[PDB]
Design a binder for this molecule. Sequence first.
Ligand SMILES: O=C(O)c1ccc(/N=C/c2c(-c3c(Cl)cccc3C(F)(F)F)noc2-c2cc[nH]c2)cc1
Ligand SMILES: CC(C)CCC[C@](C)(O)[C@H]1CC[C@H]2[C@@H]3CC=C4C[C@@H](O)CC[C@]4(C)[C@H]3CC[C@@]21C
Length: 241
Amino acid sequence: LTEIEHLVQSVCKSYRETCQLRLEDLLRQRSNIFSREEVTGYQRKSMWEMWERCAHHLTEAIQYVVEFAKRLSGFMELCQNDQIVLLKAGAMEVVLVRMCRAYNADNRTVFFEGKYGGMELFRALGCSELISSIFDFSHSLSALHFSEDEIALYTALVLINAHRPGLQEKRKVEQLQYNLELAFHHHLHKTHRQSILAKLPPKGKLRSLCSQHVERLQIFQHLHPIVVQAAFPPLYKELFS
Ligand SMILES: O=C(O)c1ccc(/N=C/c2c(-c3c(Cl)cccc3C(F)(F)F)noc2-c2cc[nH]c2)cc1
Ligand SMILES: CC(C)CCC[C@](C)(O)[C@H]1CC[C@H]2[C@@H]3CC=C4C[C@@H](O)CC[C@]4(C)[C@H]3CC[C@@]21C
């Protein structure tokens, strides 16, 4: 019918094509949990091996988010400066939101390298407080039981934010943002899910968590540079040095 029903469909399709891990796989695998022996195996790995592994997974996760963004109506018609401003500010925020699908609140585990494990899996990295904060964020989000379409629409909005500093064509970003806001709000009304609005994270929370996360990734990358399977030169250039 309207532009807006079509926009819901195209955002959800973009998400489906880029969600990386299927929800029904993630749910089915919840009973597949790392054994005590497997956990010890991970805890004994070098900090630097765990860093290599996690950095590679995080890179790949960011690439799926970039592909998601590229498929959002109007995103590719933004100027390249603005595309990069949006991705730099938002792509890791989206990854952190996407985690909640892979997180099981019943036992505080995340799907990692084919089974579920708790935060203690990552002991060798020596960032227990940061990791705990990330797990807690996913735990808060878990309680919403976000649907796949809610995740799609919400994460589109994490990216398409006209308030990011440094945008050159702010009105163009505003147009996209308003349409996405309408799509999300329409969809929540249609599905009797508007109750989630008051339960979503305060925006400051996601921003500060992400900033802390990226800061730690930068520290590790300075200490122990990784090989990146780089697909997006303008974005790579902004994050790596
Ligand atoms: O394919 C490409 O070209 C490409 C380009 C950039 C990429 N990600 C960059 C990262 C990383 C990060 C990661 Cl994921 C791992 C190790 C070290 C880092 C470091 F912090 F060092 F950058 N952290 O946040 C972002 C990010 C991206 C957008 N907003 C935030 C990923 C793939
Ligand atoms: C600060 C870093 C050095 C260590 C970060 C440790 C985390 C929080 O312990 C990371 C390590 C690997 C990360 C995961 C890598 C890949 C994915 C798939 C993506 O679709 C959702 C997020 C998800 C599931 C990540 C969530 C957070 C993880 C699970």
